[PDB]
Design a protein around this ligand. Structure first.
Ligand SMILES: [Mn+2]
Ligand SMILES: [Mn+2]
Lengths: 388, 7, 293, 582
């Protein structure tokens, strides 16, 4: 007809309380599979520009097609297992939900559909229940949720406090209470966008966000999963304000792994991603301890690390910095790069090192030799006395 | 299937 | 003089047998011994039946025990393992420490071979390494053990009739004498006969093929067949690939694979099995499931 | 002869090689020792107090140390010293450290005299709870159960107030903590207060937005229901508890399931028969596999504890209906779950019902694919015959048992082997010899060693039951026939049995029918067989008479000490030294 403001509010009600258990494989009567694909191409394919009739028959519908207590985990305990290796348990009725998301997404995403056609139809209680969801169906389930929660955040300046506060609450439980959850990765992307576009002169609750939530995440041992999305946040954060540099670098330096080679690599890697943007004036606050550590890495016995450590030498900027301050650095590295590299098996780092040194000469000859001297000298004494 | 070097 | 040690090993084992790692100071001591004892062996170890052939174990200690509840226990029953002792599993240390303890003790009741994993590089990469730290603080028990690994023989010949190796056949290797000339006293190289022996697999693509692994090759029916006929082999027993069924025949009952690590990496839901060569070399396979943990 | 070392630990506490700093702290007592109290009080604590440690491993060590300085700080008069540092370690981020910090704070609480408590301790809890950061507050929660009883009327007033706050926190994390401890805290409040104060908090935390909070409330309902006098239960506790068995979040329901019989007993014998009984079905018919099986485990204990005067009835009209259904579920864990307890119903429903009702199910399971469910059932037949007629058993169960006796999954084969000795006895030897014997002999030659060993021992259990005379005419025969089998694995088997039979065959049968074959084998190809013969004689040695010992033994147990295979060698030698034959 020409009065659909009762054709949909009756249609949605069809799709709503529908709920058909797809864990028995019976009652093959589609109905809904289509009833929605319609409610889609309807608000999408320009078949509309004025379907704002005051109605949350969508939210309700969604919040009863989506909101449920996720089922018991399908992957083992967690001690002798690595999450990266968990087989993605797929949730059936996806082909069903797949739309409720599609639609509810191709909903408030469209123009002319105000933030007050929802303001009080999408309250914290909807946010929260929505959040929990960040938990299992191989990305799919999440991915939508990721997006959804992105848009619900950058539309209602009222839930901003909440989504944030509530995203923390998950993390703290993840970090200190149970050390298990799946959406940490997804969530972090969302927090990527959010940081990148904060109040130019940073509200203080964020610095806490970073310092008391973000860094500590590097603590968990399943870091091998959200690590990258994480770094990004750590980095993005340093671009929105290079004050925080000194404490974020001092953080990683403390939380630095000690029996988990892979993490050691990751840190090293996240570290370069930071130096790369480090600010001269700041690189001086760290440096000393930073390089005090890099030193150790080079002199690790786990080629995977030592290799990632030395790769710093192939970075313009980092080298640049190292030069302007070659005075205090060269001596800290030396003993390890000049380490009497004649007791290894990896017939590769020995060369890899020569090359670093070589790259160190060309920068400040004198210093180089002068240190070589100092070392050789000391080196001599210890070989003399310590042989009584 | 975990990674070639062998599930 | 003789009861000042053989009595102690008996304990070391009793301990590991309860799943409690030996102490650092003790590992080295154990490996030192294992050394002298392993030097003396060939590269193609000739051991007479009857025996039991065991494949991959990959630190799955408990499922190792299960194996023993199947094929009997040492020294009461003769054994022969084909590498891959560490990595993947959660109790690497304990496992290897043990198997080695057994070799240093019942010197001629068990035979262990080197696998694609008794190499520093993979052990670092795939786990063992870290586990050592995670359990001993330093990384010395790692060195100590990565070095013992070098003296592990590359192959085994049961009654001159059956050939044994972790991986498989190598182009650079035509005969068994072509193997006794090699020098295994070194870290597994990236390319070459030795490397191949521990990385090579069986293919259905016929004739030598490049291995999608990264080392060794993919021999085939033809290749196998000639090998056997050549040196005088009735069966080549390797085992380096997860066979969903515990063990598998191929190349027309010529070469056989045997994975002993059940439910591999605690993920691969496969069966594992071992092969018992009797008093007159008879094929009798025993499949088993991961020990109820 | 000197005090140097110690004096250095008091220096290696700021060393900077964490690894040392650790030890120096990990021994922090023998410093307050050689330091001597009056000093320990005025120097060592104020150092541990004003020194910010980073490394967690050390931080945990110190926290644990402090809890024992009661003595070394100079006794109870002073224990209130160890507060400041713990009070800090209780704030520390990493949980484990502060967790231990609190553990101690409690332990050393019992040392403060009320005077002190009201004055120093209480305050700390006050401050901790009044914390800025959630952790502090999280910690606070665990510190009430220890001072409330001993403080003042007016202090408890305040304390109560405070604790109700940590329960109404904006942080789930704190709420969950508050919840988890709510139970142990009601247990100290005066009855009245539990009703007028606890109960309300109980209700709230039991209906939080957060399920992982709610479910921790379910656990407290059990502690409160034990403090409360029956009457009141139906008015304060009951509303809520019912609510939980219904909660949307299966995680909560799952609780009422696991902590059911624990409630049952607490609730009452009647209110059980009134609400729990129905509710209990509910869970068995739940939508979540867990909650289902979770209830299954509690069937036996539920019934056993059902009021004496209704039991056999309610089991028969309420429980038994749902049970029959469970037996045939699709979630192996629920099938295997109850498949373990179920049989404990036999002695409740008597000889009759059991055979007309339960006995059928036993067949259902006993045959079910899932090893677990068989294996979980096979393990209680040791009983049944105590209810059903021992004939009924050998008639409508033994047929299947004689099946399991040899099915694939060995752990089940075993399960039977271990249940034989009873069957054999209970059934009577002539029966055994006629229809059971072979099985018990077959096992002696199973592929899986585990199964032979089990069956080997299983003999000695039989000889104990049918006299040495029987074994001579039904066992020793075949047992020795093995000595032939080509496979050295079986061949040995013989020598094994002997080492067991002899313990129970009297010096006689042992010397005239076993000791020969033990010698006749010391000349076998496979050394394995030989060195075992050595270990064998060392076993069946003492049972022999000093005469036969230096006669046939030593002489032949010498031809081994001089054998090629080192193993054989070692075992012969250590087969004399023990026998005292050299
Ligand atoms: Mn392998
Ligand atoms: Mn391998």
């Amino acid at each position: 007809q020409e009065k659909l403001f009762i054709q949909k509010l009756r249609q949605c009600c069809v799709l709503f309380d529908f709920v058909s258990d797809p864990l028995s494989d019976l009652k093959w009567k589609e109905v809904k599979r289509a009833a929605l694909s319609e409610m889609v191409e309807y608000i999408t394919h320009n078949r509309n520009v004025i379907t704002e009739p005051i109605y949350p028959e969508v939210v309700h519908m969604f919040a009863v097609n989506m909101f449920r207590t996720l089922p018991p985990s399908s992957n083992p305990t967690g001690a002798e297992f690595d999450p990266e290796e968990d087989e993605p348990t797929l949730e059936a009725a996806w082909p069903h939900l797949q739309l409720v998301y599609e639609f509810f997404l191709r909903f408030l995403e469209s123009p002319d559909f105000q933030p007050n056609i929802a303001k009080k139809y999408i309250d914290q209680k909807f946010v929260l229940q929505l959040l929990e969801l960040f938990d299992s169906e191989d990305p799919r389930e999440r991915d939508f949720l990721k997006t959804t929660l992105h848009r619900i955040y950058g539309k209602f300046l009222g839930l901003r406090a909440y989504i944030r506060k509530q995203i923390n609450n998950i993390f703290y439980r993840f970090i200190y209470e149970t050390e298990h959850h799946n959406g940490i990765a997804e969530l972090l992307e969302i927090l990527g966008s959010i940081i990148n576009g904060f109040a130019l002169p940073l509200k203080e609750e964020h610095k806490i966000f970073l310092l008391k939530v973000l860094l500590p995440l590097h603590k968990v041992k399943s870091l091998s999963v959200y690590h990258p999305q994480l770094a990004y946040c750590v980095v993005q954060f340093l671009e929105k304000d290079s004050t925080l540099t000194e404490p974020v670098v001092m953080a990683l330096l403390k939380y630095w792994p000690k029996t988990h080679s892979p993490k050691e690599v990751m840190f090293l890697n996240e570290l370069e991603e930071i130096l790369d943007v480090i600010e001269p004036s700041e690189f001086v606050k760290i440096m000393e301890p930073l390089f005090r550590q890099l030193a150790k890495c080079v002199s690790s016995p786990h080629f995977q690390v030592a290799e990632r450590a030395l790769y710093y030498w192939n970075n313009e900027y980092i080298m640049s910095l190292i030069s302007d301050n070659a005075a205090k650095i060269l001596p800290i590295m030396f003993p390890s790069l000049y380490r009497n590299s004649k007791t290894h098996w990896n017939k590769t780092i020995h060369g890899l090192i020569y090359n670093a040194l070589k790259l160190f000469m060309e920068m400040n000859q004198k210093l180089f030799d002068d240190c070589t001297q100092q070392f050789k000298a000391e080196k001599l004494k210890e070989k003399l006395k310590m042989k009584e | 299937x975990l990674x070639r070097x062998x599930x | 003089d003789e009861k000042v040690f053989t009595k102690e090993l008996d304990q070391w084992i009793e301990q590991l047998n309860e799943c409690k790692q030996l102490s650092e100071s003790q590992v080295k001591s154990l490996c030192e011994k294992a050394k002298e004892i392993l030097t003396k062996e060939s590269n193609v170890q000739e051991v007479r039946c009857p025996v039991t052939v065991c494949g991959d174990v990959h630190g799955q200690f408990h499922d190792l025990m299960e194996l023993f509840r199947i094929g009997g226990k040492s020294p009461d029953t003769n054994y022969l393992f084909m590498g891959d002792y560490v990595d993947r599993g959660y109790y690497s240390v304990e496992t290897v420490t043990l198997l080695v303890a057994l070799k240093v003790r019942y010197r001629e009741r068990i035979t262990i071979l080197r696998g694609n994993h008794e190499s520093r590089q993979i052990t670092q990469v795939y786990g063992f390494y870290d586990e050592c730290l995670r359990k001993y603080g330093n990384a010395n028990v790692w060195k100590y053990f990565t070095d013992l690994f070098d003296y592990l023989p590359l192959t085994a010949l049961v009654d001159g009739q059956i050939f044994c190796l972790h991986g498989g056949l190598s182009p650079s290797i035509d005969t068994l004498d072509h193997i006794r000339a090699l020098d295994r006293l070194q870290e597994v190289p990236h390319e070459g006969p030795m490397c191949d022996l521990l990385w090579s697999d069986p293919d259905d693509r016929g004739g030598w093929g490049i291995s999608p692994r990264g080392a060794g090759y993919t021999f085939g029916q033809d290749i196998s067949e000639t090998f056997n006929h050549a040196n005088g082999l009735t069966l080549v027993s390797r085992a380096h690939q997860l066979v969903m069924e515990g063990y598998n025949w191929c190349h027309d009952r010529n070469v056989v694979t045997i994975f002993s690590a059940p439910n591999y990496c605690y993920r691969c839901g496969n069966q594992a099995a071992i092969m018992e060569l009797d008093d007159t070399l008879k094929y009798s396979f025993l499949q088993f499931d991961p020990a109820p943990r | 002869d000197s005090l140097y070392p110690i004096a250095v630990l008091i220096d290696e506490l700021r060393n900077e090689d964490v690894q040392l700093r650790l030890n120096s702290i990990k021994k922090l007592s023998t410093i307050a020792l050689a330091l001597g109290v009056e000093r320990t009080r005025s120097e060592l604590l104020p150092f541990l107090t004003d020194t910010i440690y980073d490394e967690d491993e050390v931080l945990l060590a110190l926290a644990e140390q402090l809890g024992t300085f009661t003595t070394l700080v100079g006794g109870p008069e002073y224990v209130h010293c160890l507060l400041p540092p713990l009070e800090s370690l209780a704030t520390v981020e990493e949980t484990v450290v502060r967790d231990k910090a609190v553990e101690s704070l409690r332990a050393i609480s019992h040392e403060h005299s009320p005077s002190d408590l009201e004055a120093h301790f209480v305050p700390l809890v006050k401050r901790l709870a009044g914390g800025d950061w959630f952790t502090s507050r999280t910690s606070a929660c665990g510190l009430f159960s220890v001072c409330y009883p001993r403080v003042s009327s007016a202090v408890k007033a305040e304390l109560r107030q405070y604790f109700r706050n940590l329960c109404s926190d904006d942080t789930p994390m704190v709420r969950r903590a508050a919840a988890s401890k709510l139970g142990e805290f009601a247990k100290v409040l005066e009855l009245d207060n539990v009703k007028s104060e606890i109960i309300p908090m109980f209700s709230n935390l039991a209906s939080d937005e957060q399920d992982s909070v709610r479910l921790l409330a379910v656990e407290a309902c059990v502690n409160i229901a034990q403090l409360l006098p029956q009457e009141d239960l139906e008015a304060l506790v009951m509303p809520t508890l019912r609510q939980a068995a219904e909660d949307k979040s299966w995680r909560v329901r799952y609780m009422v399931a696991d902590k059911f019989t624990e409630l049952q007993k607490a609730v009452g014998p009647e209110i059980t028969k009134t609400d729990l009984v129905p509710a209990f079905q509910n869970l068995m018919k739940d939508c979540e596999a867990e909650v289902r099986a979770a209830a299954s485990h509690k069937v036996k204990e539920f019934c056993e504890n059902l009021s004496a005067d209704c039991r056999e009835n309610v089991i028969m009209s309420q429980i038994l209906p749902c049970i029959k259904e469970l037996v045939s579920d699709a979630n192996q864990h629920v099938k295997s779950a109850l498949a373990s307890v179920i049989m404990g119903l036999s002695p409740i429903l008597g000889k009759d019902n059991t055979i007309e009702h339960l006995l059928p199910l036993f067949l259902a399971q006993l045959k079910d694919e899932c090893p677990e469910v068989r294996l979980n059932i096979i393990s209680n037949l040791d009983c049944v015959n105590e209810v059903i007629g021992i004939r009924q058993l050998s008639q409508s169960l033994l047929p299947a048992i004689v099946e399991l006796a040899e099915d694939a999954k060995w752990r089940v084969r075993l399960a039977i082997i271990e249940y034989m000795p009873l069957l054999a006895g209970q059934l009577g030897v002539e029966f055994f010899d006629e229809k059971l014997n072979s099985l018990c002999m077959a096992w002696l030659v199973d592929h899986v060693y585990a199964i032979r060993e089990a069956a080997t021992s299983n003999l000695k259990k039989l000889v104990e039951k049918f006299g040495k005379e029987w074994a001579h005419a039904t066992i020793i025969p075949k047992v020795l026939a093995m000595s032939g089998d080509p496979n050295y694995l079986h061949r040995m088997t013989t020598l094994f049995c002997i080492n067991v039979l002899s313990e129970v065959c009297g010096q006689d049968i042992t010397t005239k029918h076993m000791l020969p074959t033990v010698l006749r084998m010391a000349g076998d190809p496979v050394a394995n067989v030989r060195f075992n013969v050595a270990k064998s004689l060392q076993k069946i040695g003492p049972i022999l008479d000093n005469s036969t010992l230096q006669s046939e033994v030593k002489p032949i147990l010498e031809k081994l000490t001089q054998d090629q295979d080192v193993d054989v060698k070692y075992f012969a030698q250590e087969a004399l030294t023990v026998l005292s034959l050299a």
